[PDB]
Amino acid sequence: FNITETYLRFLEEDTEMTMPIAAIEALVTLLRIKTPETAAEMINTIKSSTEELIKSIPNSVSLRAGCDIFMRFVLRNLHLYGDWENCKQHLIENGQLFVSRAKKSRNKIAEIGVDFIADDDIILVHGYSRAVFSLLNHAANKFIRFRCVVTESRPSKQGNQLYTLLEQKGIPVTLIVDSAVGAVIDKVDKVFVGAEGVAESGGIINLVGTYSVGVLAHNARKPFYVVTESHKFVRMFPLSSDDLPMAGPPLDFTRRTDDLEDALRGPTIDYTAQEYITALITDLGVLTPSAVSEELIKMWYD
Amino acid sequence: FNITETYLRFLEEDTEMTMPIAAIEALVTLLRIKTPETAAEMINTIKSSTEELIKSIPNSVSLRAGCDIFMRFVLRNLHLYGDWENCKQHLIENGQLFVSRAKKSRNKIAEIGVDFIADDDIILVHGYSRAVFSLLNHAANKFIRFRCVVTESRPSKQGNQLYTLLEQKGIPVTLIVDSAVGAVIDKVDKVFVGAEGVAESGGIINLVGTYSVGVLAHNARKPFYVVTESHKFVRMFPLSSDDLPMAGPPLDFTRRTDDLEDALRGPTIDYTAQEYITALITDLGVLTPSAVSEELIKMWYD
Amino acid sequence: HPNAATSDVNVTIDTFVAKLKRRQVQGSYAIALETLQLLMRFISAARWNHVNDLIEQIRDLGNSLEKAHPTAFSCGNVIRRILAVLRDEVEEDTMSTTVVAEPLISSMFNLLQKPKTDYRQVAIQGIKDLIDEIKNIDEGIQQIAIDLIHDHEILLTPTPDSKTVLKFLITARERSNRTFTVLVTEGFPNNTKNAHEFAKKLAQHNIETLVVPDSAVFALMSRVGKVIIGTKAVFVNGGTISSNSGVSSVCECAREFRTPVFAVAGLYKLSPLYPFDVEKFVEFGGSQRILPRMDPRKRLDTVNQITDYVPPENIDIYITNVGGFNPSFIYRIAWDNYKQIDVHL
């Protein structure tokens, strides 16, 4: 029936259906066909489909995290030894209810996380997450004064994409390069970030230059922010500064070339430690330091 | 006779004969025609031509520094109250001898500054200078082992230019982005930086992301280098982290745009403080901190 | 909901409102006691018979109380504390009226799995327990705190205003085995009088007293063993609002010299609210106490603030009646006493 193909169908869609929430909705559809009455036939085939999904993954982390929460909810269903049928109907229904919860959470955060941006504050924003930009838009809806500084992130050129999406709103902007990002931290009140994942330790899984931002801000004593939707938690503990799950290059040094083809190769995803984050924002209240681990301990019961 | 036009003629030339040394050679040619005997008729017209040169400058500092040294040498000529003809002949001759001194200094440095690169050390190089690359080439001539990491500098895509010039030698390389430059400082032994100017205080005048490199290296405790030819000293004291002589923008924030035209604007030249430099290398011996200021005090006699 | 229903039956609402606005009431400890006696009067006098209508009414009363006075966090916390004590006993009561409820631990995750009696008596006793808790905090502090400070160590102290901290210091000086030198920053525009009384009570007990001007803090930081804070209110992220003047700079001075920072507080003093901005939370002082003469005060726009904020980056321990906790853990102590809904009243 396929799950990778269902995820590939979301091309011109996105924005509303968040990348993990669309993968979770795809997991529920695959579950509801071949009877969730059996726990040997279904769960094993769900595990095989997640393994097939991980094997097809090039540079995504959040899809593995979202699977875990689904699994957890499924197991928790019939924890009351309830009827093998009303528990099943509640499990199938919690697929569309899971996607509907992404809207309700965004409604919560955009009213909570506008408080952090005070009267007339210049912001240097890095990365693009649907939660952080929704704060930025619904603060403009709240009629609050804020300036914006764009970071030239280099994955699939994200800075230019961010700049254009800020133009459509009506907020004054200018391009700042990630090389010169050190020379900006004096005319900037606060530094904001959108994460691809949040660590078990309390650190962050992010883009092509975020640790560098974290350290410079720690030097300048200027605050460093992480805002996300509460589903990007993996049981992952990157022990060192340069160790992450990869399908491509972990720093490759190429031979002598004349035509110039083999060059680009650098760490596209980088980790930053727990100390560098001043504040973290999700729908699960306002919490930063040891909070992430407590969430993971509560979920995994281990 | 023009001086700006003489400097514009160096297009396909450059290299070995440096940009400031070509401006100093242009200063001597302008001097030697209209009689250097008169100190009233000539020095005022030399000052007007330097003022016209500064007004034509878009993004260069070293041309203003090179004029000063010339002036100084001219004044020092007739310090012995010598014949107003033999002192003049020695002044005109010290123009071609000045450019010949750029050869002798490069011969000195490339044998002195190869000692810093030890047995098998991974180098991360940023900000291309003729002195630092001459160290890199004449160490390969010395048959020593060294690995090289390319930084993606963004003034006019300099990183790609640096990468191609390293390919023409026979040394293994790979592209590292200035955003991710924080994620490299553990596998890199030493960080080398070539300067556009060295401060009165002991700091550095450099490109689109060098302070950021300096701070990160200070955090990682990994050494930070400055290698140059001894003519890039101005009596300049940037008081703050973001204050420099400019003909363009000092951080501009533009209005709401749809066609996307006004964006790029960021600090193209950035300063770093004296503390971040571990070591400095010139032809004037091996010296780093207050040495620069001593030189400047020795010149200016003030 | 307005105070139109509670006027003849309850009069003491408006007298507390009057005590806050004109600042007739002083010190978080006292504000808490009054709100306790308010809720004591609310349950003893009112007639409700229904439970959910009652709780939401209490929520609106607390909402109006915090809007009446923003620096009365001890007011806001005490109500929130009883609210949660109520909510647990209601959830226990609903399980018996309907008829695993014990998975592993006492977690959170309210986003995952879905869902006449002596309840009023429990509400009564719940207030009584809160009073007794506020009555005795020092006993719970001294058993954790007087284990960390050594002989021949010099203690620098901003905020001498706290009754809690001074009494912690006197119990340690009672131990003849422990010797320490006390440096006290003055805190000129506000704390001065309190700092002088602090220095008097230390001499009364014969402890090596040293009065320090707010300029001289740097000139001593090389010699300082430890730093202690007399905080008013503690927060989610860890940070504190303290009882006025000259703390933030001292903490900045300590961190640069890598000198340890201590904080003495209570759980009622601890708040489940988040300080997103210091700009809103901090109260500003009266510039009258700085400079005389009003014709020069046209041109002399003087700045003075009472309450001082410390970011969590500096302090390391919050010794309470329960125990010593790190700022990266204090949120859990908070959630153990106040619920997630009981924040936005």
Numbering used by the authors:
A (entry chain B), B (entry chain A): 4 to 305
C (entry chain C): 10 to 108, 113 to 128, 147 to 376
Task: Reproduce text from the manuscript describing this model.
For multiple rounds of initiation to occur, the GDP on eIF2 has to be exchanged for GTP. This reaction is catalysed by a guanine nucleotide exchange factor (GEF) eIF2B. Here we have determined a cryoEM structure of eIF2B in complex with the GDP-bound form of eIF2 phosphorylated at Ser51 on the α subunit, which sheds light on the molecular interactions between the two molecules and provides a basis for understanding the regulation of translation by eIF2α phosphorylation. The structure consists of two eIF2 molecules bound to opposite sides of the eIF2B hetero-decamer.
To improve resolution in this region, we combined particles from both datasets and carried out 3D EM data classification applying a twofold C2 symmetry and using masks around eIF2 molecules in the complex. This classification resulted in map 2 with slightly lower overall resolution 4.3 Å, however, the local resolution for eIF2γ and eIF2α-D3 was better compared to map 1. In a low-resolution filtered map 2 contoured at lower threshold, we could see weak densities around eIF2γ, which cannot be attributed to this subunit (blue and red masks). Each eIF2 molecule has two spatially separated interactions with the eIF2B hetero-decamer—one through eIF2α-D1 inserted in the pocket between eIF2B α and δ subunits and another contact of eIF2γ with the catalytic eIF2B subunits. Another contact is formed by eIF2γ and eIF2β interacting with the catalytic eIF2B subunits γ and ε. Although eIF2α-D1 containing the phosphorylated Ser51 is relatively constrained through its interaction with eIF2B, the domains eIF2 γ and β in the proximity of the catalytic portion of eIF2B have relatively high conformational heterogeneity presumably arising from high mobility and do not adopt the same conformation in two eIF2 molecules bound on either side of eIF2B.
